[PDB]
Structure 1
Amino acid sequence: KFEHPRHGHLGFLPRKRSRQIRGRARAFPKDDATQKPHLTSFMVFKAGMTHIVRDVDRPGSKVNKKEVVEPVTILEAPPMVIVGIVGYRQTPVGLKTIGTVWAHHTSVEFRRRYYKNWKQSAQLAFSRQKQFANTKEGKVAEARTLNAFAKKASVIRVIAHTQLRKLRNHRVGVKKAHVQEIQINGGNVAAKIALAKSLLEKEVRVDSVFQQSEACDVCSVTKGHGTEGVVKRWGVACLPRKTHRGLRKVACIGAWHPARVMYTVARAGQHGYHHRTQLNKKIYQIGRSVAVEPNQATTTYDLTAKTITPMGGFVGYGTVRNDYVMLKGSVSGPRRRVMTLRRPMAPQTSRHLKEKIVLKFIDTSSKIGHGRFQTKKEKNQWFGPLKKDRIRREER
């Protein structure tokens, strides 16, 4: 008889706190040995959002026509320092690591990750591996396992961490290094270590991994809300105003049989702070740093000079100082939470996902307000030498 479509999605149970804030790709793309060895993932930090105006393509009705305002997300992406190389056997109980070569140097932020205090400690992390690397048996026991990553290995995963001393953001209160294994999806695993062995202990910047107009998948950890009730966690319904013992509940959570509450009925508990993936988030610009190009947000039709950082920074994040990546739309983070990009799974051959992009406008109007001004040198033009600077720029 009467019914409705079921509330919430059973394929995101249990609604549980993710085991770490670090967004972590559960699966990397299928290894097409017909490609070149490359890096298929990258960790960025969610700065915040803004929106942009685009010259549209893909002839439809709202397309092949005047521009469009589409909301975007700014993800600050400093270059990642590769430290290790990790290979896996394809054994009948699923992949298993067959060793891990490290670099000879290992940044002081990486070694913090193997601690939880690091300032009362004695900093012995990787002490007998720096020493033993300078040995000869070290070089033996290192090429003995690199000559293994070709015999036994199929999956080769460098270990990259983030540069945070290169991320002058303070509101990212952490000084450890976020450590992430990254798949290499080239071919001829012999030539797959060759990449890994090469870029080891070298910085990997995000445009080396990704290109501008193509889409990624964003492994991330949702913004947490603590214990949310049934109406907020599952979005079931509110009982009528007349209800006793209140109305933000599921009335019937079980028949007489089965005489147990089902895993399908809605209950209150952890909402948010879940690991999500957000397939097919399309990059619109992968612009470089202000230290190298202090004209981030001025493409061709905003011949003024400006940067991505809005007037007064991104709210609750700061200024973007590094190789930001501009996606399209939502990303399952709060500000300054590490996001992991990933090259996508989908066939991606479409006139709605493989089309190239030019951005005719970006908004740097302040997040903190309403903002009516781009590029604060426009605000000074609206006003005059008002009494704040008048009491300083006329008192000399």
Structure 2
Amino acid sequence: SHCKFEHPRHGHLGFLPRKRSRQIRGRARAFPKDDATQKPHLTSFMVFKAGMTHIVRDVDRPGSKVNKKEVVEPVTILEAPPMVIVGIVGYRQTPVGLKTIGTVWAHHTSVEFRRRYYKNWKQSAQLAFSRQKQFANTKEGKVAEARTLNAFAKKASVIRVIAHTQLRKLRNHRVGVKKAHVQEIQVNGGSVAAKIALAKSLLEKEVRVDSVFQQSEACDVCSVTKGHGTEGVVKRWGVACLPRKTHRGLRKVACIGAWHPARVMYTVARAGQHGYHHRTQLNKKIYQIGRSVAVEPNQATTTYDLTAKTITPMGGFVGYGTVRNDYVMLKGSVSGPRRRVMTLRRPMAPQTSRQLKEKIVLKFIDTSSKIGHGRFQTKKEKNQWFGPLKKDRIRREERLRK
């Protein structure tokens, strides 16, 4: 017999299985299509999530009742220290897929890059890349590098560079890790020879986020969601609770199948892992690419708000701390908690709609405290509200006797 009343099913079957992700970093499963006409360029970057806040802006959108009016939008702040390029790889097409041809390594590598090959780096012999390092500079090693670069030139169709993060430059106290994160970044544009030339030019050097992304464009984000362990069916899939007088518990699915087929199907909701899944999220607009505070202290000062202040709120980002490097401000939210590393990618979808083409100009950036109900934008404002306090009177009466 058919069901009396109908509704859509609970949950999307294209996100199965709901298992823990294989790794903690976000990795792009595909890169945007290569257009050989353009100039060669990089296509991704790695960043670290540090809290969120909100902004004010005027809207430029003809036909909307919000035209030429001020709106408040929440934003996410992600810290972006420069990456370092250490290698070059190439791929050739086969009837069974893409195959790696070889790898060209840089002549020198960092300790943070080499730490990634150990579990106990401090109490070890620390010999990674020593034989390669001494062999690559003899007569034969130079010949081998020439050979592999010619093989790239002859047979490759895809060129990627190997890059890694700089945790020593990140200088964060709650990110415990000291071994670098490593990823391949594909080079798009130009021909294979031009790609190889660009990749060889930027070897052993560092790359800034502002040389990959521009202020008012959009991006895709690859990252892993927050974990919640073992979860029941009501939270995991959003099924309805049962009436109060139900014997043996209410937070269940009442019927898990018919008599035939004499089986439980893969489409029925069950308890299990929730969270810690990889996700690719589509159209996040960049609102600001901010310089390092050591270089420019007035990070959050706008043209309309002349107050001098940085992007870090009073009392710090809860559980994260101060932002000390270059950073990016994205509209809206991203998957994952504070302190997790994520990947920014150049967009795949068409970028021709009005909302994606709009130019963004900020008017106010909020820097009040995220502990409690913050009501001051700066410490000077708080000091103007409260005059001198008892602690200050004691300080100024015991710092003058000398």
Distance 1:259 1:187 in 2: 58
Specify the SS of the correspondent of 1:117: coil
Consecutive unaligned residues in structure 1, runs of 5 or more: none
After superposition, the Cα gap between the structure-2 partners of 1:393 and 1:301, relative to the gap in structure 1 and judged at 3 Å, is farther
TM-score (norm 1): 0.97
Match of residue 335 from structure 2: 332
Q: Does 1:393 align with 2:385?
A: no
Question: Deviations for 1:343-367, whole angstroms, at most 9, x for unmatched residues?
Answer: 0100111101121100111111111
Question: Deviations for 1:87-120, whole angstroms, at most 9, x for unmatched residues?
Answer: 1111121111111111111111111111111112
Distance 2:280 2:37 in 1: 26
Instruction: Indicate conservation of the 8 Å contact 2:114/2:128, yes or no.
Output: yes
Specify the SS of the correspondent of 2:41: coil
After superposition, the Cα gap between the structure-2 partners of 1:388 and 1:46, relative to the gap in structure 1 and judged at 3 Å, is same
Question: Deviations for 1:219-268, whole angstroms, at most 9, x for unmatched residues?
Answer: 00101111111111111121122222211111112111222211111111
Distance 1:227 1:352 in 2: 39
Question: Deviations for 1:103-152, whole angstroms, at most 9, x for unmatched residues?
Answer: 11111111111111111221111111211222222222112111111211
Query: What's the offset of the Cα at 1:61?
Result: 2.7
Distance 1:348 1:120 in 2: 51
Match of residue 185 from structure 1: 188
After superposition, the Cα gap between the structure-2 partners of 1:101 and 1:37, relative to the gap in structure 1 and judged at 3 Å, is same
Query: What's the offset of the Cα at 1:218?
Result: 0.4
After superposition, the Cα gap between the structure-2 partners of 1:393 and 1:89, relative to the gap in structure 1 and judged at 3 Å, is farther
Question: Deviations for 1:318-364, whole angstroms, at most 9, x for unmatched residues?
Answer: 10011110001111010000010000100111101121100111111
Distance 1:390 1:184 in 2: 62
Query: What's the offset of the Cα at 1:390?
Result: 2.6
After superposition, the Cα gap between the structure-2 partners of 1:267 and 1:150, relative to the gap in structure 1 and judged at 3 Å, is same
Question: Deviations for 1:160-207, whole angstroms, at most 9, x for unmatched residues?
Answer: 110110001111110010101111111201101111111121111101
Deviates more, 1:76-85 or 1:246-255: 246-255
Distance 2:353 2:397 in 1: 61
Question: Deviations for 1:259-295, whole angstroms, at most 9, x for unmatched residues?
Answer: 2211111111111110011111111001111011111
- What's the RMSD between the two structures over aligned residues? 1.2
Specify the SS of the correspondent of 1:62: coil
Specify the SS of the correspondent of 1:279: strand
1:78-157 matches, cutoff 5 A: 78-157=81-160
Distance 2:258 2:391 in 1: 70
Instruction: Indicate conservation of the 8 Å contact 2:234/2:251, yes or no.
Output: yes
After superposition, the Cα gap between the structure-2 partners of 1:246 and 1:189, relative to the gap in structure 1 and judged at 3 Å, is same
Match of residue 249 from structure 1: 252
Specify the SS of the correspondent of 1:5: coil
Distance 1:389 1:24 in 2: 52
Match of residue 221 from structure 1: 224
Distance 2:239 2:295 in 1: 51
After superposition, the Cα gap between the structure-2 partners of 1:261 and 1:148, relative to the gap in structure 1 and judged at 3 Å, is same
Query: What's the offset of the Cα at 1:394?
Result: 3.4
Instruction: Indicate conservation of the 8 Å contact 2:312/2:323, yes or no.
Output: yes
Instruction: Indicate conservation of the 8 Å contact 2:61/2:68, yes or no.
Output: no
Query: What's the offset of the Cα at 1:65?
Result: 2.4
Q: Does 1:77 align with 2:80?
A: yes
Of 62, 65, 69 in structure 2, the residue corresponding to residue 62 of structure 1 is 65
Of 238, 243, 267 in structure 2, the residue corresponding to residue 235 of structure 1 is 238
Consecutive unaligned residues in structure 2, runs of 5 or more: none
Distance 1:390 1:28 in 2: 62
Instruction: Indicate conservation of the 8 Å contact 2:88/2:160, yes or no.
Output: yes
Q: Quick one: percent identity of the two aligned structures?
A: 99
Distance 2:24 2:391 in 1: 43
Q: Does 1:272 align with 2:243?
A: no
Instruction: Indicate conservation of the 8 Å contact 2:47/2:343, yes or no.
Output: yes
Instruction: Indicate conservation of the 8 Å contact 2:231/2:272, yes or no.
Output: yes
Task: Give aligned pairs, total.
Answer: 396
After superposition, the Cα gap between the structure-2 partners of 1:382 and 1:144, relative to the gap in structure 1 and judged at 3 Å, is same
Distance 1:375 1:83 in 2: 42
Match of residue 172 from structure 1: 175
Specify the SS of the correspondent of 2:289: coil
Match of residue 285 from structure 1: 288
Deviates more, 1:41-50 or 1:363-372: 363-372
After superposition, the Cα gap between the structure-2 partners of 1:275 and 1:393, relative to the gap in structure 1 and judged at 3 Å, is farther
Query: What's the offset of the Cα at 1:155?
Result: 1.1
Instruction: Indicate conservation of the 8 Å contact 2:159/2:187, yes or no.
Output: yes
Distance 1:285 1:347 in 2: 22
Distance 1:165 1:226 in 2: 32
Match of residue 301 from structure 1: 304
Deviates more, 1:124-133 or 1:275-284: 124-133
After superposition, the Cα gap between the structure-2 partners of 1:81 and 1:256, relative to the gap in structure 1 and judged at 3 Å, is same
TM-score (norm 2): 0.96
Deviates more, 1:252-261 or 1:101-110: 252-261
Distance 1:268 1:151 in 2: 53
After superposition, the Cα gap between the structure-2 partners of 1:62 and 1:337, relative to the gap in structure 1 and judged at 3 Å, is farther
Distance 1:251 1:390 in 2: 69
Query: What's the offset of the Cα at 1:62?
Result: 4.4
